[PDB]
């Protein structure tokens, strides 16, 4: 089992509320811990007028620029702008997008492109298996508290 968490770097601060404007790291369309869940607790700040406006479109402006694999870089040229995918793999869903899926999306946080990365409360640790760096990251908890990765049991968005 694994919960949902909002993973951030370290160097200045803010909270889930202040999100608007920032650059996000995603795993891919509808990938739960990198979208489904995030979009849930963000929806209120989206001002999304429902259909037929794509709920993606709403989050397409709210976030200054990001990487959401499988995103129409032709209509929403911004859900892909941060995508490390040099080539036709830009914003790709395949593995040719170094920031595709969990680790990649988290690695999007590592190279200072994104500020918040929605990747499972397991990745980051598994990823940065080095003591210091493990201490060099924060985690946004639903109650707008920036609790540490180790505290994910509490600092988790949805179950």
């Amino acid at each position: 089992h694994y919960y949902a968490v909002a993973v951030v770097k370290k160097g200045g601060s803010f909270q889930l509320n202040e999100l608007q404007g920032l650059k996000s790291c995603h795993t891919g369309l509808r990938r739960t811990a990198g979208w489904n869940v995030p979009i849930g607790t963000l929806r209120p700040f989206l001002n999304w007028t429902g259909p037929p406006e794509p709920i993606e479109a709403a989050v397409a402006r709210f976030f200054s620029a990001s990487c959401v694999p499988g995103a129409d870089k032709g209509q929403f040229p911004n859900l892909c702008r941060l995508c490390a995918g040099t080539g036709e793999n830009k914003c790709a869903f395949s593995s040719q997008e170094p920031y595709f899926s969990y680790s990649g999306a988290f690695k999007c946080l590592k190279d200072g492109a994104g500020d918040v990365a929605f990747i499972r409360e397991s990745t980051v640790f598994e990823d940065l298996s080095d003591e210091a760096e493990r201490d060099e990251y924060e985690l946004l908890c639903p109650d707008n508290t920036r609790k540490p990765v180790d505290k994910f049991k509490d600092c988790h968005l949805a179950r």
């Binding site: 001002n47 007028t49 406006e53 402006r61």
Partner: protein, 181 residues
């Protein structure tokens, strides 16, 4: 009788018989005032000044205007700020931006302005809009807080055929905005 009349159908890329100030320019057969961004002023006013009244004989003018404008916003829940048809002293230039539609500068009546305009506002302003939010049409005259404002539906993105004609004999202007249906 003094009489000036012009009818523009396709605002070509060169468009000489007008004056563009601030941002505003022609585009795909159309005059553009603001390119859907943050904090920009747009206004275009035909080149020949027209004389409305006669001091020599205190006679006011009859005038009609018809135009199909469009306000298409990226988000139907965050429009701004407004579109307005103004009449003002020949040597006129972009006044305060923001929610003043670039023609006025004070909520309070400032006789000096000498500007009567019809405004189609799309962003409520506590300080001077009918407290109920409601987007609306209004008749401005040296203030910003109109003397009459009637609430109206945006139809974000649809063409709108409007027409306004004042009455010299009756000193009465009428504005009608009709969304094709």
């Amino acid at each position: 009788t003094e009489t000036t009349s012009f009818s523009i159908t396709k605002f070509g890329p060169d468009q000489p018989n007008l004056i563009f100030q601030g941002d505003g320019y022609t585009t795909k057969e159309r005059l553009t005032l603001t390119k859907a961004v943050r904090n920009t002023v747009g206004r275009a006013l035909y080149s020949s000044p027209i004389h409305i009244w006669d001091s020599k004989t205190g006679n006011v003018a009859n005038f009609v205007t018809s135009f199909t404008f469009v306000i298409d916003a990226p988000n139907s829940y965050n429009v701004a700020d407004g579109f307005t048809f103004f009449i003002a002293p020949v040597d006129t230039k972009p006044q305060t931006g923001g929610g003043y539609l670039g023609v006025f500068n004070s909520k309070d009546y400032d006789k000096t302005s000498q500007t009567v305009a019809v405004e189609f506002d799309t962003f409520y302003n506590t300080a001077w809009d009918p407290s109920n939010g409601d987007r609306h049409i209004g008749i401005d005259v040296n203030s910003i807080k109109s003397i009459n404002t009637k609430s109206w539906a945006l139809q974000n993105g649809k063409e709108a055929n409007v027409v306004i004609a004042f009455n010299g004999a009756t000193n009465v202007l009428t504005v009608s905005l009709t969304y094709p249906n």
